[PDB]
Structures are given as C-alpha cells and as structure tokens.
Structure 1
Amino acid sequence: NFAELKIKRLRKKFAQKMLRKARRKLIYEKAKHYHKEYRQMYRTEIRMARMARKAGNFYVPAEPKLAFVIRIRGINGVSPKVRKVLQLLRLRQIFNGTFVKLNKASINMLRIVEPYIAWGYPNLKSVNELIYKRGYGKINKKRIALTDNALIARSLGKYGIICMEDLIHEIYTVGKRFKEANNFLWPFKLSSPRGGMKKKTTHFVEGEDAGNREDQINRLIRRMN
C-alpha cells in the first residue's frame, strides 16, 4: 500500500521543483530582456539627439509620463481642496512618496497642491532604491514587504507582473496595466532628508524645494532613502 504511496510524495515534490526551476528561468530571462530594454530607451534618445544636431534642427524629447510626488508639508492647517487631493494620492504623512502617471487630470491635480508637495520625474536608478529598499505591498489591506517574488505574482501575476523587474518595467515604462501596480505598492515611508532642505515653504523657482523638481529630484531621492 505504502510502496506506491511513497512514489506519490516524491514525484509531487519533484513536480514542484521543476515547476519552480521553470519559473526561475523565466524571471532570469525576462530581466535579461529588460536590461536590453533599458539600454534600448537610454541609447535611442541619444540616437535622436545627435541626428537633429547633425542638421540644423532640434529633437524635442517627450515629457516623461511618470513623476514621483513627495509631500513635504505637514497636516496642520490644510485647505479642504488641498486635503482631498493629498488623500487621493495616498500622501497622508510628511515625506511620503507615490508614483503618479502624467495626463491632463494629473497635472491639474498637481498644480493646485504644489506648496504642499515636491514632485519631479525620477531616473531609472531612482526607481530601484524605492522598489527594493522601501517597497511595501498592499496585500489583504496589510503593508507587507516585498521579500519574495511570490507576493507580487498573486495580485498582479494574472496581469503579467510576477517579480521585481516585471514590476519595475511596469513602473518605469508606463504600460497599459499601470493602475493596479501603483495600487499594489504602499506609499513609500521615506526618511527625513539627510543634509537638509533649502526652503520648505516656497516654490523651487525662488530657491525653495516645493513644486516641480523636474530633474533635480534624483538628487533628493538619495537623501530620502
């Protein structure tokens, strides 16, 4: 009776092992394509910049379709129109971070709240220090840290996202499944800026740090994290 029942336990253990190894090969190779895809977009913008300068023209790049919004002002004394947007972007604490894609609904939400936030377009590396070091997942309405690839694959795995690089490529390259990817990530609990801020109250144009940090946000991200 147990002679063939022994084969039941060992074969099913073997079936999961090859199944785990088959998925392990998929994680490795999709990331290899993504490294080629990240080298694809970085180099092809250098391709387009030089050729317009070869002739007497200019290559206007597209404004990136994702920005990183950081609330830099506290919750005391906040206008209700301002307060509603901050809880609609999941920015309830000071120095909280979230990913927001760019469309006419988004900037018009962002252009009413710039004294209370500091937002800008992040770099490719700047995503990595957020997803890996501060990446927390909203699983069953619980802030669960991303310590294994199985966590993402069960809430977005039937969407095509099952690992870090599947999540990062869905974040960095704003694809057509982006909405639940930002919903999966908890708003980032960024630490206080090491080295200090210039001025919290005023906009970035006159030497403050509020408003659109369109390029220099990558300097500030390394101070938060």
Structure 2
Amino acid sequence: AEQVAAERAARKAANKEKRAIILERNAAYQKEYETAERNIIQAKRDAKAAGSYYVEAQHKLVFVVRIKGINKIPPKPRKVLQLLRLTRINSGTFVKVTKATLELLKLIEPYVAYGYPSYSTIRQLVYKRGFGKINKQRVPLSDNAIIEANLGKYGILSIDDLIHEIITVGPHFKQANNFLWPFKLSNPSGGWGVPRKFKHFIQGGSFGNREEFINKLVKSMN
C-alpha cells in the first residue's frame, strides 16, 4: 500500500469523530452537574418554605491525604495505609465512603487529614496530577487516547468520562480509582495554618475529618 492518502486520512477521520463523541458526552455531563446543585439548592429552599428542614445525602467519597511521615507507625495502622495506597507523606487518593471503608479512616485518623472534596478540586487533580497505570509503569495522563486503551473495555472513552465516575461514584468505580496512581502532592503553599500539625481539626490541628475544609488545603498543594 501507499500509506500516504488512505489510512492517515481515515485515522484522522476516526480520531475527529472520537472528539465529537467526547464533546457530545461532555455536553450531556455539563447539563447533569448544573441540574444537580440547582435541584438540591432549590429543595433546600422549599424545605424552609414548607416549614421543614432538608438533610442532604452524606458525601459519597472523601479525599484522604497522609500527614505523618513513615517512622514510628504502629503495625495495624500501617497495614491500613498500604491497603489505601497511601505510602508517602502528602499522598492522596479518593476513597469511597462506606461503613466498611469508614472504619479504616477512624482507625487511621492520627496519620491522615481527609474530608469531602468538591468538583473543582477533582478537576485540577485529574488534569494536573494525572497518572495512569499500564503494567505498573506510572505515566502521565496527558492525551485522551491512553485512557480508552486502558479503560475502554470498562467504558470511559475520555478523561472527562473518568472524572465523572471519580466524583459521582459510578458502578465500576473501584478500579477507576485504582487505575489512577496515588496523587503525589507538594507541601501547602500558604502553610498548614496551625502551630502544631498533629492535633485534631476540632482541637485546632490538621488530622481527622474536616468535611468541606479539605478543598482549601488541597488547592494549595495542587
């Protein structure tokens, strides 16, 4: 064959329609998030207007980042971190919220600082600190064709597809979280903000659950 006119044009033709699928699916997604908050903010308004109170569903996933170093770790907590893929100091992974999973967090609090993240925080983490996994071999995410080569047979033919499952907790979420290398973050830019880092967030420290306050801490690292 000549390989100058036929295959390359078709290869671009196949590539160009793939972007359209990604764009069309994103248009489906972008409509979904806006309806999400617009229906939970309005429902919060209507509860008070009806003389009631609205309790939203608890956050379905948390971002857990290690605070302590590696020395002087008891054996039971240490095994928890290894199974959580949290190896280094200032390393983070998204953890599905579940009573089975939640018990490890309350057993690993003195060495982690976790909380409920927001879509903005996930948006930068996937884009900036995006690392794949292909026969180990941690490589940057970058292109939108590496993901479909590793996750396409679990759907998810785009990075925007992946970032939707990592926040909305899709059906096949465990390996989608497991496909991403643990997020290796730097020290906070504005500082930890507390004199001593190893007090609980209630006691004026850093470790333990902090709900929505984790967004501010992660943005400095990322």
CA distance in 1, matches of 2:144, 2:135: 17
1:72-221 equivalences in 2 (<5 Å) = 72-197=67-192, 198=194, 199-221=196-218
Q: Which runs of 5+ in 2 are unaligned?
A: none
Q: Which runs of 5+ in 1 are unaligned?
A: none
| Partner residue in 2 for 1:223 | 220
Do the aligned partners of 2:115 and 2:210 also contact (CA within 8 Å) in 1? yes
| % same residue | 52
CA distance in 2, matches of 1:36, 1:10: 39
Higher Cα radius of gyration: 1
Do the aligned partners of 2:130 and 2:142 also contact (CA within 8 Å) in 1? no
CA shift for structure 1 position 83:
0.2
Q: Residue 35 of structure 2 aligns to a residue in which SS?
A: helix
CA distance in 2, matches of 1:200, 1:71: 12
CA distance in 2, matches of 1:132, 1:25: 20
Q: TM-score, normalised by structure 2?
A: 0.96
| Partner residue in 2 for 1:47 | 42
CA shift for structure 1 position 14:
2.5
Do the aligned partners of 2:47 and 2:53 also contact (CA within 8 Å) in 1? yes
CA distance in 2, matches of 1:75, 1:223: 23
Q: Residue 112 of structure 1 aligns to a residue in which SS?
A: helix
CA shift for structure 1 position 11:
2.1
CA RMSD of aligned residues (A): 1.1
Q: TM-score, normalised by structure 1?
A: 0.94
CA distance in 2, matches of 1:108, 1:130: 26
